[PDB]
Enzyme design. Structure first.
Site, mmCIF file in Angstrom:
data_model
loop_
_atom_site.group_PDB
_atom_site.id
_atom_site.type_symbol
_atom_site.label_atom_id
_atom_site.label_comp_id
_atom_site.label_asym_id
_atom_site.label_seq_id
_atom_site.Cartn_x
_atom_site.Cartn_y
_atom_site.Cartn_z
ATOM 1 N N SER A 1 0.846 -1.191 0.000
ATOM 2 C CA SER A 1 0.000 0.000 0.000
ATOM 3 C C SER A 1 0.884 1.244 0.000
ATOM 4 C CB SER A 1 -0.953 -0.074 1.184
ATOM 5 O OG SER A 1 -1.796 1.065 1.225
ATOM 6 N N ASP B 1 1.553 -3.667 -4.568
ATOM 7 C CA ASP B 1 0.413 -2.812 -4.859
ATOM 8 C C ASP B 1 0.723 -1.375 -4.469
ATOM 9 O OD1 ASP B 1 -1.999 -1.605 -5.271
ATOM 10 O OD2 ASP B 1 -3.181 -3.090 -4.169
ATOM 11 N N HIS C 1 -6.444 -5.888 -3.542
ATOM 12 C CA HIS C 1 -5.404 -5.146 -2.842
ATOM 13 C C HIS C 1 -4.588 -6.054 -1.930
ATOM 14 C CE1 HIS C 1 -3.620 -1.684 -0.677
ATOM 15 N NE2 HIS C 1 -3.942 -1.018 -1.770
#
Lengths: 434, 144, 144
Positions: free
Chosen positions: A127, A151, A236
């Site tokens: 993230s 990601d 995600h």
């Protein structure tokens, strides 16, 4: 100059992969002796990301457990985004710089007091954590070996530069898992612009299969109210799940392929890798440098094993009737020497004559070699209405399937006369030949 | 004098007998970035019953332009009082809940009842519309 | 050093153990006609559960002035994402659905979590607030 840390570095162990027990305070060397730290072995650094709650996400324990499973007697460090990430999301985007400076100071202090080799550390970034690590290391004097992220965040990082976002020069080697890119440019959560020396775009990044619609309604369902919130986060976390699966299954890594575009990969003209292409994905990735951004593609199973194959095919359609058809569904099946798939479909529009076509097929079971093939052609008129009167048909000659993992230009081969593929008809058998 | 084609819709199996309430929109906003292949969700309330979450599709959305589409419901409603005009997205989470997402402005609405010809003129409120992606719908009422 | 009074709320009988989420409002509008003894209804959604139709009261409403009140809920919510600010009326029917009814404007909101001190700053949208009587609530989100 070690009083503005405000981000505690933890150090878990295989016996405790849930609760942070240690606190490696920078500058205060006492913590290193307090908690065992093998200065010879490799040491990873996990950097989680934004969390609406006030605790670590549910994937960190599994990740760290698998990391120890793969590389025992190796230290692991965790960070404490908490107390700063809970704030408004843009505030976290700003605080990425502070956390990066903090991590750089940590690593510099380590390389000063203990001169630990910087070539034995991974900045596992997820993230916002990926961008945090990327902005980190760059301040380090001795660079970093691997900065493999997961990601990378898109917002407030597109239309940026290396100092403000992850860059290939931030470390010796880098790789990212673009697991989600659906949406307009600059607004999709997952950055689509390639960043590292090698980038991976599973399924094309549009979405992932191991999920469903998710949120039934704003109030009835659970948007972020736990429950279906994880389902909403379909992809995600698929990055980290893929990474942990690859880490656990070291023996048979999935072989992601290098290509030019997602559509080109779907067509299946860009699989052969004679040169340094089609490198592995995960921990066992082959360290390589490229003159520019190098996109890649592959497919996957639903959730647990992943590690699917690739058996792209070519057809030398050659028939008599020259009435072109479009948007037709082709169904094929294959049998091998280990297992066999039964009813895998695929699509191929713009069918014509005297012309050669190709497409990409994937299966989720090991087959080894392959003996025979099925080439059924489906219809929406199952009943005996369209079972007698002349329906459109073609003729099949040879077939040029190509095995992915091992380059095998096996030449499939229609029988003497027993093919005449026709709509709403039994498939046409094929065998190894030539 | 010649072949006369016709069309309609229907429920699943038992009662059939659905209605038809085609709609027009006088889209008129400031930002002129055209979008395509977007999903519009609306709902309506009447004087007998009410539908809740009926969706529909309308690509090629633009500005300063009027659009129209066909809607069907499977419950008797009689008259109709208020309307819902939610605009759905695939970014439910708070990622796309703050930063400026594309939006438009809504003026009047010209739904037309099928069985009975009623050019009821729906009517946005004084200023409380600003339809935006991933946002609460915009209410409307009978007017004019 | 002396008598120390205290206060709290509770559920009906079985679990008790309610929360406390007192709120502040920075009312700031254009029309300056003061009103009194009005009922405000709000609702909140979080990350564990959500309340739906909890009411409360706040008389002596004015403009360019800040107010506050105490709210309680009987379900664990953890964090909180969005908010509802409906303003109720005793004229539900379409009599008071068109003609200009009193309304205000909403800027920021400064709810404060009780058990954990969290000065979360709620945040009206760009222009889509205009709280009005007998109207749909106004959405809010985490911000700043």
């Amino acid at each position: 100059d070690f009083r503005d840390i405000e981000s505690k570095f933890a150090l878990r162990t295989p016996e405790d992969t849930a609760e942070d027990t240690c606190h490696l305070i920078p500058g205060v060397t006492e913590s290193v002796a307090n908690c065992h730290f093998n200065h010879s072995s490799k040491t990873f650094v996990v950097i989680h990301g934004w969390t609406v709650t006030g605790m670590y996400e549910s994937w960190v324990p599994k990740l760290v457990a698998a990391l120890y499973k793969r590389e025992p007697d190796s230290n692991v460090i965790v960070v404490d985004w908490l107390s700063r990430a809970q704030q408004h999301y843009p505030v976290s985007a700003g605080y990425t710089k502070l956390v990066g400076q903090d991590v750089a100071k940590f690593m510099n202090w380590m390389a000063d007091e203990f001169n630990y080799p910087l070539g034995n550390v991974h900045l596992l970034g997820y993230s916002l954590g990926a961008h945090a690590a990327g902005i980190a290391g760059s301040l380090t004097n001795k660079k970093v070996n691997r900065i493999t992220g997961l990601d990378p965040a898109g917002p407030n990082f597109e239309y940026a530069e290396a100092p403000s976002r992850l860059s290939p020069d931030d470390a010796d080697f880098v790789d990212v898992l673009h697991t989600f890119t659906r949406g307009s440019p600059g607004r999709s959560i997952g950055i689509q612009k390639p960043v590292g020396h090698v980038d991976i775009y599973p399924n094309g990044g549009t979405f992932q299969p191991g999920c469903n619609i998710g949120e039934a309604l704003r109030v009835i369902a659970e948007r972020g109210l736990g429950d279906v919130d994880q389902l909403v986060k379909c992809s995600h976390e698929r990055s980290v799940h893929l990474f942990i699966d690859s880490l656990l299954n070291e023996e048979n890594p999935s072989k992601a392929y290098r290509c030019n575009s997602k559509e080109a990969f779907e067509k299946g003209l860009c699989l052969s890798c004679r040169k340094n292409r089609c490198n592995n994905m995960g921990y066992e990735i082959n360290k390589v440098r490229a003159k520019r951004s190098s996109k890649m593609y592959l497919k996957t199973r639903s959730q647990m094993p992943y590690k699917v194959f690739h058996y792209q095919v070519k057809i030398h359609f050659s028939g008599t009737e020259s009435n072109t058809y479009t948007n037709q569904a082709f169904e094929i099946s294959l049998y091998g020497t280990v297992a066999e798939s039964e009813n895998i479909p695929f699509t191929l529009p713009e069918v014509s004559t005297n012309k050669t076509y190709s497409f990409l097929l994937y299966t989720e079971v090991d087959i080894g070699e392959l003996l025979m093939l099925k080439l059924k052609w489906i219809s929406d008129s199952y009943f005996s209405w369209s079972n007698w009167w002349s329906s459109p048909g073609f003729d099949i000659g040879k077939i040029r399937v190509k095995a992915g993992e091992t380059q095998k230009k096996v030449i499939f081969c229609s029988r003497e006369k027993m093919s005449y593929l026709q709509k709403g008809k039994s498939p046409v058998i094929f065998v190894k030949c030539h």
